[PDB]
Amino acid sequence: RVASGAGLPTSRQTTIMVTKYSEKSPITIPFELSAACLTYLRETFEGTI
Amino acid sequence: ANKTLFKTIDEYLLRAKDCIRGDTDTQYVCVEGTEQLIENPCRLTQEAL
Numbered sequence: 001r002v003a004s005g006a007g008l009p010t011s012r013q014t015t016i017m018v019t020k021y022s023e024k025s026p027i028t029i030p031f032e033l034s035a036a037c038l039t040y041l042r043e044t045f046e047g048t049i
Numbered sequence: 050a051n052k053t054l055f056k057t058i059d060e061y062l063l064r065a066k067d068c069i070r071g072d073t074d075t076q077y078v079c080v081e082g083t084e085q086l087i088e089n090p091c092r093l094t095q096e097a098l
Contacts, residue, residue, distance in 0.1 A: 006083040 061093050 001010055052060065066086035068079030091097055 008083050 057093065065089060065092050
């Protein structure tokens, strides 16, 4: 604020209030895995190269 | 208003400045709320534009 020699009042209340919010925007990404790729991934038949 | 030219200058700034109530929707005479005065060169020159 600023002091003044004018007769107009200046604010008696330093520091104004401010309300704010935390607007969440979640995201989601599917990614498929074929059941074949999984069943071959863990298992090892050891039958051929 | 008749004066020596320097006294007309001191009247031109100390006194001649207008005080319209410009904050309101339409023109009004001064509140005496010590809002800034408005200089009027035409009042001294007496020449409307």
